[PDB]
Every structure is written in structure tokens, then in C-alpha cells.
Amino acid sequence: NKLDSKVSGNYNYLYRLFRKSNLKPFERDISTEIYQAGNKPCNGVAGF
Amino acid sequence: MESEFRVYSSANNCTFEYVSQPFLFKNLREFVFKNID
Numbered sequence A: 001n002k003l004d005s006k007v008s009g010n011y012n013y014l015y016r017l018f019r020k021s022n023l024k025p026f027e028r029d030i031s032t033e034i035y036q037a038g039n040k041p042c043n044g045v046a047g048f
Numbered sequence B: 001m002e003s004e005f006r007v008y009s010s011a012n013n014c015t016f017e018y019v020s021q022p023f024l025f026k027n028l029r030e031f032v033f034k035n036i037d
């Protein structure tokens, strides 16, 4: 709490809220593609 | 020789670099690749 906290907040740290499938053990994904939950294609931009 | 040439164009967030002794009339060379855990 004395190193990884900022009053402004720390954005240098990120987590993956949504992924299509659960990761296999000891697997690391560094992809920054859009999670296409919807049938309609996000096509690199946010949407419904 | 043209070295790496057209094998790759760019490298992003490269996290690994193992360099060791090279892996490789006819010579049979057999390899088995497994990706487990």
C-alpha cells in the first residue's frame, strides 16, 4: 500500500476483466485485441 | 547470407531469448514438440 497506491491512482497496472476462454495453467496472454462478446464485430472500437 | 531477413518484421514485448548450442548422404533429425501447462 506504500508503493503501489497513488492519490491520483496507478494505471501502470492492468488486469483482464473479460476473456473468451479460461487460461490453461502457467499461460500468459499479452494480447490487446477487443473481446467481441457481441455477434456484431467491434472492429477495433468499443460499442454495444 | 541475408541473416534473419523476412522471417519477422517487428518485435513487441519480447519476453524470451534462450541461446545455446545449435539443434541441427542424408541426416535424419527427429523432433517432438509438446506444450503442456
Ligand SMILES: *[C@@H]1O[C@H](CO)[C@@H](O)[C@H](O)[C@H]1NC(C)=O
Pocket: A021, A022, A023, A024
Ligand atoms: C488458444 O487459441 C485458440 C485459437 O482458436 C483459442 O480457441 C483457445 O481458446 C486459446 N487457448 C485457451 C484455452 O485460452
Ligand SMILES: *[C@@H]1O[C@H](CO)[C@@H](O)[C@H](O)[C@H]1NC(C)=O
Pocket: A030, A031, A032, B012, B013
Ligand atoms: C504489448 O505490445 C502491444 C503492441 O501493440 C502494446 O499495445 C501493448 O501495450 C504491449 N504491452 C503488453 C504487455 O500488453
